[PDB]
Ligand binder design. Structure first.
Ligand SMILES: Nc1nc2c(ncn2[C@@H]2O[C@H](COP(=O)(O)OP(=O)(O)OP(=O)(O)O)[C@@H](O)[C@H]2O)c(=O)[nH]1
Ligand SMILES: Nc1nc2c(ncn2[C@@H]2O[C@H](COP(=O)(O)OP(=O)(O)OP(=O)(O)O)[C@@H](O)[C@H]2O)c(=O)[nH]1
Ligand SMILES: Nc1nc2c(ncn2[C@@H]2O[C@H](COP(=O)(O)OP(=O)(O)O)[C@@H](O)[C@H]2O)c(=O)[nH]1
Ligand SMILES: Nc1nc2c(ncn2[C@@H]2O[C@H](COP(=O)(O)OP(=O)(O)O)[C@@H](O)[C@H]2O)c(=O)[nH]1
Ligand SMILES: [Mg+2]
Ligand SMILES: [Mg+2]
Lengths: 430, 57, 427, 427, 430
């Protein structure tokens, strides 16, 4: 009918996927055992005897993260094929996970992907989750997209990655893995979404009433954005938007492929009784810088793309009122060459809640995706970070011995500079 | 002995978990009448009330 | 007898067509299971105009559903009146339309063109008294903007003599639903100018405006907008199905309204319009209908005629009413508003009367006109497309499908010629 | 027949209008739900003058309610007769005018004027023959004065032929509701002198005095205060609404009473007025009414004519009476009081008789006249205007709206010229 | 339809607001939880289900006052986002409350007040309460008006402040804070009303029958004046007066806005049984020099402004006679510049009594708002007090060390002198 494939690499990707498939199971009414107590074909396969299987593959170079799913309650749902795990993690090294160890299991991963690709009659996109700072997430992901680019060619390759935080960093060599992965993504990926952990921590502290969140709370917020994104194909709606339609509208240039994500309403289980939750109210909350899933101020640049998807009772009449109201805001700047600016989508499925959830049972919600020059602010910090250690050559020998040729480091540096120049030139009115 | 008990903490929070759904805003308005003007129905009742009172009563 | 065939585009066309076939079902009295259950013998007089009769009394419309993805077809099939359509009259692709004009016209357009023309031949060759084609599409989309013009050109090559009348929804001035719509409209109109005979323009934002001002709809849905469009486009063909004291068929409408081959864009409007409350206070008469028809708050298109001047215009009336009253009102409205009309066409307006009005209303009217106010609509897309000219880089998304950049310059040159054509006919 | 359109402005206008249409409905016998439940066919002769007819035997009054804030409109909607008025006739803003005349004219009057003009034109061209407009307003400054004079100018531009008869309640020159009145009164007089044809002046203080003296009302209510004004208004148009032995329309009244274009302000009065208890013992005849009409206490404008002199006088009557009695009584009242009339105008006093009297009273009358006693009211407001303009207090609000102080000087120059014209014509 | 928003600043402002909203809820029949056991939209918003919310924001630099509301019974009614609490107070220092600490929280406060106005369609007017003696009330109020004046432009900004008493005082640095504030509201305030605690105590003792009032009793008296002012916007009447009407009528110039207030009858709940208190009775009681809540001599203060808002069963005829009778008094001398000099508002809504209250159940009552030149008497007292301390530089070091320039003191000193010069010039005949 129309099928999508999801693949998860590098711890963070898997745990986000665990949240997503928990959310999808409840949304469609599928028990963890796979039986029923619809539109399954969009994400699940009816294997007969009442059991269903997800269209996803989990691959990690170490078994700890995958063994969590194997020994968890989720184990009865996933095919044992889809739970591939390695023998030795890449250990924060891009070179190690791309050359020495990545090629050991990369052929195994592709065969299982192609095997599921046989069952997808109308396969029109892929969903890939990365952690840029990770060695496995960046190194293995680069090789896999390069292989997948020639395997299928004209097929949508959507990425969902986690950018290093402006100040929070869990890996010391993280800028090394971030730039090298970015240089490889920039040629093959159709469109890669951008989020960071620090903005998730701040939004979870302010909006939600959580004194001390964990990775589970962050993943569930991400999972809701994924569900809202994929609801257009899964359910009937007054304005359904296809994956290829996102590709046409979101990235109106050659190689600018990094939008930012926003989601509203994000309210406590306590306040919203005291609030009107109007579509005009939630629309205005989307554009306020405090709600961005990336820690970059839009006032440092301008917008050139917007995409709003409404989950709920949102009548199309009010949507036109909301977007017209937004254009009157002087705090929001739109580039001259994008008079239209927006792509709307209205779907009748309400938001999905989770037992023990961190969010309220709101009637209506809207997911926002926006491409803006403000991401260049994030580039400059990564560029300056990399230049500081590499001037003194802080970690060259670790990568070189693992298959990295030293000539590749300046090449990826210049590729980032070309991205920065391209972003800056687009921001100039003509 | 002293008796002082009250569990507002649960009452506020458990209720706040359940009945979250705000702003029903039911879109049940239909156009099919305005193209099918019911003025005929209102005058039908107006004549019916007029005839009953003037003639029968 | 005087047959027409109906064709629909992917999301906008099939939804509007779905509501339209409900509307015709109520007017002729068709039960939701396809069996006639009306109350008058006049309904079956000219049912051949829109319907074929199958053995058993089940009546099937002359309609075809075209889309690039199966998203809309499932919605229509599950609809209230989904049974009525022919099971073999569904043609759909298996790929994402992508809202791209060039992709829809070339990539999947050639794949589907061979099949859709063959399916159309079923209705075309099985009607002896055929005069008509009725296309429903949206201009800002990907299936009706591109593939609709592909069908329009192919049908013109096959059947030159038949009338090609299409209904079109234009991207909104303030905010339309999609970013790339300036490109889609500019490409589509180039084919529409040369190929189509009659073009109807409808704006979504004007429909919202009419709902708030007149109907007082606190929550207007998509069905309400489709109902207004269905009211107007059903009224156009009323002369072909019912008797009247002065008929006006499609060819009469075209000959009177079209002075020159390219200036044939039409604005549409329906009367009477009133809300729940004030409808009880209205003294519904012909002069009141004349007030609503010429009112600057009742056109489905957001273009002020007062900023320009009028070409020929027409109005079609339904209901039992006096002929002298119609003639006097149109004579008076022409003499009262001399400045808005053009002197070099005496008798700028045309009148028509039909016997049977629509259900629930004792008399109704349909307004179709042409004027120089269309130039503002073209200026809107031209200015947006001019800013998109620096985004001829963004056109790299289009050329990847196979389009060449010089087509866009050809299309905008055609717009410039059309705009200058309207300007010179203003004098 | 010969129609009149009624317009109500602001707080003072709408409350008077509510009572006025209550009186008119009682006169013609229209049930508050719009049905006819009268018992007289003569009520149906000229019901078209003030009413339109809606299909189904319902009548919609020719009333347009105008305001800048919804508080008064909500009060009228909840009223007993609020269902009668057409819902679309209600035009209102979303801002308290603030009673700054510059604000009410330029800031918010201009924005609303476009909507009111079209709503006026809706009823203006829906009648067989319009003859004049009726406006009720107070000289406050926010909407009744500022917007009222703006609409009066626009209507004069649109309809030079028709009679723009306006009713004005001048601020009471001993006690009144706002410190900024003489600014607003001075500007309103400037606009009303040139643009209006008939201006009727009413004082609340005289209404209070009339109620206490004649009506013996312990607590004069605003309902009875508006009731008296409504009764006077209905008597003015009663000649057009019912036949009589000697008819007199507004144009006859305007031509007869007004000797020169500027001096056209009128004082009004009504008779018979009697307390609720002693009406049984009164022997109501023509001499009784003549004494009541010419009594200096029954006049509802607080300017004693015995101080000044009379120029023109008019008398209206309702009921069956002998024409000789009216002619003889009028000659006697003219002949005795020769000290109060101009020598160069013989027969200073006009008559008219109407067949049908108002409900409840077997016989009734109405007094309208023009005198030089108006010099007191203009002098009083001029002195108040002189003081503040010398201090230039409160003017910062008007300056912020764009009104320059030279406009005040021109307005006072017109006011002073009118006073001098009254002074010289007294000789 | 027509809407108002209120802001409360400092220690004093919150407590007055506490009394006001109990008065509104009892008047409108709303339980403390917000559920009913109309004109609500003027002050309240309906948040779905059956719960209401007030259009108010409580702001202070210390958490003590706000936490009292959070722990009080009315905690259910207010929205937790509306309660903003600072960290350390201004310590009765204008400089500390204006620059060093006020600027820390000013952006957060301004966001919420603007966010609340988005639900406020038919909005014209604000109500801000100040404590002139306190540093936070004077310091934060000046900065708050500076921002609101430029963000909103031509909008009715009305203030309800407490003027320092002529002799009764609780702060030694009170004249400094008052003079620095009077310099700022003289340009950034459309029209502000003031009362002093000394006359409030005296009226609460002579006319009212309380031997020793607390702050709760004084706040209740203030709340009734505010309720009478807002009565026109909520209920129908023979003469309704809007916010714009008050601004136009009460002031003859730009800098002479300051009116005085008077409320009658102020008789007690026990002594009230003997008097009918007709319209003439209450009208005469208003103009008594003792009934002012500002300790100023009406003999020195000519009148060029008056506003008589009546509440209860009132006939316009009696008011006209009462006003005419008042004008005949020789002692009450109006200025030559104010012939008419009156605005009157008759409203059919009777006043309200509070359980545990301290006011009579009067059938009719009248609130009085007038501008008189006697306010220049209070300015002279404040000017002398400032000069005595500043002559020997009593407390210059505290304000200078908190970011305030020394030269601002003569600037504010000259600003008062011009204001007093304006009052003397306006009061003089011509
Ligand atoms: N949102 C979110 N981010 C996570 C989560 N877990 C880890 N991350 C981020 O993702 C990154 C994971 O990279 P690594 O720690 O190197 O793990 P890896 O991807 O397997 O890479 P290697 O183990 O070194 O080969 C971390 O730096 C975190 O910042 C999670 O549960 N949720
Ligand atoms: N009428 C009245 N006035 C009060 C009340 N409480 C405080 N005040 C006034 O407030 C002044 C002192 O300021 P505060 O109340 O402390 O407010 P503030 O501006 O926050 O002062 P700081 O916290 O020291 O900066 C005193 O002079 C009092 O006149 C009250 O309950 N009623
Ligand atoms: N009025 C109305 N407009 C619609 C409806 N469905 C879709 N549209 C419009 O159609 C546009 C999408 O274009 P598309 O569906 O590709 O046009 P098509 O290929 O001709 O059907 C959207 O921007 C909508 O504004 C409907 O039911 N009513
Ligand atoms: N006779 C009478 N006068 C009224 C009534 N209601 C209000 N007024 C007067 O009308 C004046 C207010 O006029 P208003 O409508 O506000 O005019 P505007 O301010 O220019 O818009 C006040 O001075 C009142 O004295 C009423 O019922 N009867
Ligand atoms: Mg990772
Ligand atoms: Mg304090």
């Amino acid at each position: 009918m129309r099928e999508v494939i999801s693949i998860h690499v590098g711890q963070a990707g898997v745990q986000i996927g665990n949240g997503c498939w928990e959310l999808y199971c409840l949304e469609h009414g599928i028990q963890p055992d796979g039986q029923l107590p619809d539109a399954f074909n969009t994400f699940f396969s009816e294997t007969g005897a009442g059991k269903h299987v997800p269209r996803a593959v989990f691959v990690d170079l170490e078994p700890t993260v995958v063994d969590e799913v194997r020994t968890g309650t989720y184990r009865q749902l996933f095919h044992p094929e889809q739970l591939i795990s390695g023998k030795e993690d890449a250990a924060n090294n891009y070179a190690r996970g791309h050359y020495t160890v990545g090629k050991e299991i990369i052929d195994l991963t592709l065969d299982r992907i192609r095997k599921l690709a046989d069952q997808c009659t109308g396969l029109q996109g892929f969903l890939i989750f990365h952690s840029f700072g990770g060695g496995t997430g960046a190194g293995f992901g680069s090789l896999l997209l390069e292989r997948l680019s020639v395997d299928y060619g004209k097929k949508s390759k959507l990425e969902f990655t986690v950018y290093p935080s402006p100040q929070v960093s869990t890996a010391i060599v993280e800028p090394y893995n971030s730039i090298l992965a970015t240089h490889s993504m920039i040629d093959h990926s159709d469109c890669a979404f951008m989020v960071d952990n620090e903005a998730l921590y701040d939004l979870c502290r302010r909006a939600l009433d959580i004194e001390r969140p964990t990775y589970t709370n962050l993943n569930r917020l991400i999972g809701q954005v994924v569900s809202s994104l994929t609801a257009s194909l899964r359910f009937d709606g007054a304005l359904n938007v296809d994956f290829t339609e996102f590709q046409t509208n979101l990235v109106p240039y050659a190689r600018i492929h990094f939008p930012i994500c926003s989601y509203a309403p994000v309210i406590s289980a306590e306040k919203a009784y005291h609030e009107q939750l109007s579509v005009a109210e939630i629309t205005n909350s989307l554009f306020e810088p405090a709600n961005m899933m990336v820690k970059c101020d839009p006032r440092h640049g301008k917008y050139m793309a917007c995409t709003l998807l409404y989950r709920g009772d949102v009548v199309p009449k009010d949507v036109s009122a909301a977007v017209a109201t937004i254009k009157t805001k002087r705090t929001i700047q739109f580039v001259d060459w994008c008079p239209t600016g927006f792509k709307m989508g209205i779907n009748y499925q309400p938001p999905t809640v989770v037992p023990g959830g961190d969010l309220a049972k709101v009637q209506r919600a809207v997911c926002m995706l926006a491409n803006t020059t403000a991401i260049a602010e994030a580039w400059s910090r990564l560029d300056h970070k990399f230049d500081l250690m590499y001037a003194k050559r802080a970690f060259v020998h670790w990568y070189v011995g693992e298959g990295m040729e030293e000539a590749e480091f300046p090449e990826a540096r210049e590729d980032l500079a070309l991205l920065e120049k391209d972003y800056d030139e687009v921001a100039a009115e003509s | 002995q002293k008796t002082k008990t009250g569990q507002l903490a649960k009452e506020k929070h458990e209720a706040k978990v359940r009945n979250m759904v705000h702003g029903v805003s039911t879109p049940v308005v239909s156009e099919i009448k305005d193209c099918l003007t019911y003025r005929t129905l209102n005058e039908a009742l107006d004549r019916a009330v007029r005839t009953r009172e003037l003639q029968v009563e | 007898v005087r047959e027409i065939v109906h064709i629909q585009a992917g999301q906008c066309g099939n939804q509007i067509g779905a509501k339209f076939w409900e509307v015709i079902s109520d007017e002729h009295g068709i039960d939701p299971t396809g069996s006639y259950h009306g109350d008058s013998d006049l309904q079956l007089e000219r049912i051949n105009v829109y319907y074929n009769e199958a053995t058993g009394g089940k009546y099937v419309p002359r309609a075809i559903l075209v889309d690039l993805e199966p998203g809309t077809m499932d919605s229509v099939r599950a609809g209230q009146f989904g049974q009525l359509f022919r099971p073999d009259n569904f043609v759909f692709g298996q790929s994402g339309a992508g809202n791209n004009w060039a992709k829809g016209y070339y990539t999947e357009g050639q794949e589907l063109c061979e099949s859709i023309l063959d399916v159309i031949r079923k209705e075309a060759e099985s009607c002896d008294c055929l005069q008509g084609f009725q296309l429903v599409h949206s201009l800002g989309g990907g299936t009706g903007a591109g593939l609709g013009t592909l069908l329009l050109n192919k049908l013109r090559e096959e059947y030159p003599d038949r009338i090609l009348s299409t209904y079109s929804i234009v991207p909104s001035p303030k905010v339309s639903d999609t970013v790339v719509e300036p490109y889609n409209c500019t490409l589509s109109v180039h084919q529409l100018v040369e190929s189509a005979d009659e073009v109807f323009c409808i704006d979504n934002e004007a429909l919202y405006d009419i709902c708030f001002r007149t109907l007082k709809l606190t929550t207007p849905t998509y069905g309400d907008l489709n109902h207004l469009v269905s009211m107007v486009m059903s009224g156009t063909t009323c002369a072909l199905r019912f008797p009247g004291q002065l008929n006006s068929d499609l060819r009469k409408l075209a000959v009177n309204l079209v002075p020159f081959p390219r200036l044939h864009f039409f604005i549409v409007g329906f009367a009477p319009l009133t809300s729940r409350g004030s409808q009880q206070y209205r003294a519904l008469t012909v002069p009141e209908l004349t007030s609503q028809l010429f009112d600057n708050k009742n056109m489905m298109a957001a273009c002020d005629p007062r900023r320009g001047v009028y070409l020929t215009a027409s109005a079609h009336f339904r209901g039992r009413m006096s002929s002298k009253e119609v003639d006097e009102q149109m004579l008076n409205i022409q003499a009262r508003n001399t400045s808005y009309f053009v002197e070099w066409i005496p008798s700028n307006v045309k009148s028509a009367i039909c016997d049977i009005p629509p259900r629930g209303l004792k008399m109704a009217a349909t307004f179709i006109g042409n004027t120089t106010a269309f130039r503002e609509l073209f200026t809107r897309v031209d200015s947006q497309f001019q800013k998109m000219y620096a985004r001829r880089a963004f056109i790299h998304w289009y050329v990847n499908e196979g389009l060449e950049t010089v087509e866009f310059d050809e299309a905008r040159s055609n717009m410039t010629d059309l705009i200058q054509e309207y300007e010179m006919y203003e004098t």
